[PDB]
Design a protein that fits this description.
This is part of a larger assembly, with two copies of chain A.
Chain A: no helix or strand
Chain lengths: 33, 50
Amino acid sequence: AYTNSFTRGVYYPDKVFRSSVLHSTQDLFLPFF
Amino acid sequence: RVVVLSFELLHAPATVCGPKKSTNLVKNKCVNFNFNGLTGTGVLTESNKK
């Protein structure tokens, strides 16, 4: 009936390449767990 | 008769571009570049950024 979601709801918010950086973005994401 | 042309700012590879002709590319030199309307000055080099 129901299960526990996990770290699966993460998508690339845009098409810009970034590396070795922690980037803060606000978008419509699936809440963890 | 009204037609409003809505332009969606570049983010992805562009396919509908203006009449500006391209030129050849020169590496390892300070150049004034314009890539699909994105402008700037700098030296263009080879990279390992995947």
